[PDB]
Amino acid sequence: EIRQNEKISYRIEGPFFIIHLINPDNLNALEGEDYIYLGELLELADRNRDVYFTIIQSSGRFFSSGADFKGIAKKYPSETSKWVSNFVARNVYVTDAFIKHSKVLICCLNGPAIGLSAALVALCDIVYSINDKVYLLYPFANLGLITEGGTTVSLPLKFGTNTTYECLMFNKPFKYDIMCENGFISKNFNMPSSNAEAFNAKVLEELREKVKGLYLPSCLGMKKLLKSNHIDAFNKANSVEVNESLKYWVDGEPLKR
Template sequence: MIEHEKLSGGLFTITINEPSKLNSLTLSDFTRIAKLIQQADADDEIIAVFLQSTGRFFSSGAQFDYFGEFEGMEPEKKEQRLRSEIATMNVYVADVFAQHSKPLVCCLNGPAIGLAASLVLLCDIVYAMNDQVYLLFPFSSLGFAAELGCSVTAPLKLGINRTNEHFVFSTKIQYKDMLQARLIAKDFHLRPGKTAEFNSQVHTLVQESLEGKNRHAMLNIQQLLSQKDALVRAQGRETSVTLPFWLHGEPLKRFKQLQTRQRKHRL
C-alpha cells in the first residue's frame, strides 16, 4: 500500500505501508510512487519530497506472487505482458526520478532489496535510522541485470569497484560501506521499532534546514547537480540488456523457487 500526505511547511511524504509483507512492492506500486513524485513536482506549495516506509524493512523488493501470474501463460501473451509491464514500468519510473525538480529525501529505516534499493539510490539525500540498514541488489542471483538506473547511480554514489563486487556477487552493501561512501547523510541512531519517530525526526530536520533558503536557488542547484542525462541514457540500455532475461523466463523460474522455498532467499 502506497500512501501520501501533504504536511505543513511544504513537505510531501510518500509512504510504503505494508509491514506485514516487509513492504514488498508490486509493479503498480513502483508506478504509483512515480506518479506521486510527479504530483508533488507539479504542486507549487511543495518544497521537498520524502520517500519513507514503515516497520522494520524499507522494502524487501518485488512481490513474488505477482510473477506467478505468468506461469502457464501462452508465450506470445507472456512476452507482450513482460514488455508492456516490466519494460514500461522501468523506463517510466526511472524517467520520473531523472526529471524530478525538488529535493527527494529517503528515510531509510531498514534493508532495501532489488528495485527498492534502486529507488534509494535515485534519492538526493539518504538518512539512516540506525546501523542495521543495508542495500541488496540480487540481480545475478535472480537471473537478470540492473534496473531503474542503478547502473549509473550505484557507481556514482558507491564507486565502480565496490559496485562491481556487490552487483556481480549479489552481496549486501552494508551500513559501513554506505557510510564510507558518504551515501548516508546522517545516522539517527534509533533502535528498531522506532520508524515513525525516525520519519518524524527527518521531517523536522529537513524543515529546519530549509528555513530561510531561497526556493529558486534550491531548485536551480537541484537541476545543476542532477544526473538526468546519464539516467535517461541508462533507461534504454538497461531495458535492452535485462528484458531478454525476462523473455527467456529465468527470473520467473527463480522467483518461483524462492516462493516455494526451493531456493534460499538472500535476506
C-alpha cells in the same frame, strides 16, 4: 487528486510532499502497479508549486523488500509482449519519474531495501538512516537478471566502480560501513530498529528546522544545475537496462529463481 492505494499514502506539510510506504507486514514489497503509483505521486509533487522537497518514508523493519513476486497472476500474444507490458513499461516509467524529478528527493531509510526499491533509494538526492543496520541489496546475479532502475549509473557514481563490481557480481550487500565511507548517508539517527515511526517524525522535525531562513527557490535552481551532470547518462541507461532485461525474462531464468 489521484486514486487511493492501501499500500502507499501521501500528504503535504508546508514545502514537504511526504510519501509513506505503509505495508510493514509484507515488508513493503511492491507490485508493478505500486511502482507506477509511486511515479504518479512524484508527478503530483513535481507539479505542485508549493512543494520543494519530496520525502519518501516507510514502515516496520524493511524500507522495502523489492518487487512483489506473488504478482504473476496466471491474454498476451507472446512472452515478449507480456514482459514489455509488465516489466519494461513499468520500470522505464518509475525510473524516469525519479531521474527527472525537480524537487529535492529525500529518502528515510528505516531498514533494508532490496532490488528495484533499493535502486530508487540510490536515485534520491539525500538519504538518512534509522541506525547502522541498514543495507542495500541488489540480488540480480542470484535472480538471473541485470541492473535496473538506473543502478548501472548510480552505483558506480555513489559507491565507486570496484566496490560496485564486488557487490553486484557476487550478490553482496552494500552495508552501512560502505554507505558511510562513501558519504551515501547524510545522517544516521541511531534509533532502535522497531522505531520507524519515531524516526520518520524526527527527520521531518529536523527538516523543518533546517529550512528556516533559506530561499527555497535556490534549492530548486541548484538542483536543476546539479542534475545536468548525469542526466544524459541516466536517461541512456534507463532505456538500455529495460530493453536488455527482456532476454533474461523471456529466456525464463528469473521465473526459476
